[PDB]
Design a protein around this ligand. Structure first.
Ligand SMILES: [Ca+2]
Ligand SMILES: [Ca+2]
Lengths: 68, 24
């Protein structure tokens, strides 16, 4: 359960600094076959960004991942 | 390949783009 979510986070957090950045999210999305504007990527960060620092920490990832 | 949780994260991240592609 939690090891799967930690693993998914690591796939996005490519530099391992504990924060998914816009550039990292662009990268992952692009290499799954998506063509995204700077606008659409920012929009994706906002799905999870709660403190409004413009990136997704692990805690923010958890709560996006476990709510629907 | 996507590790299942990553696919769920990809769909969740895509929520607003998906909604707006559904409209268009
Ligand atoms: Ca990072
Ligand atoms: Ca944040």
């Amino acid at each position: 359960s939690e090891e799967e979510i930690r693993e998914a986070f690591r796939v996005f957090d490519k530099d391992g600094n504990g924060f998914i950045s816009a550039a990292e999210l662009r990268h992952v999305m692009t290499n799954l076959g998506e063509k995204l504007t700077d606008e659409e990527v920012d929009e994706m960060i906002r799905e999870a960004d709660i403190d409004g620092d413009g990136q997704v920490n692990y805690e923010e990832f958890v709560t996006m991942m476990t709510s629907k | 390949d996507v590790t299942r949780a990553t696919r769920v994260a990809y769909v969740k991240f895509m929520r607003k783009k998906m909604a707006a592609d559904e409209v268009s």
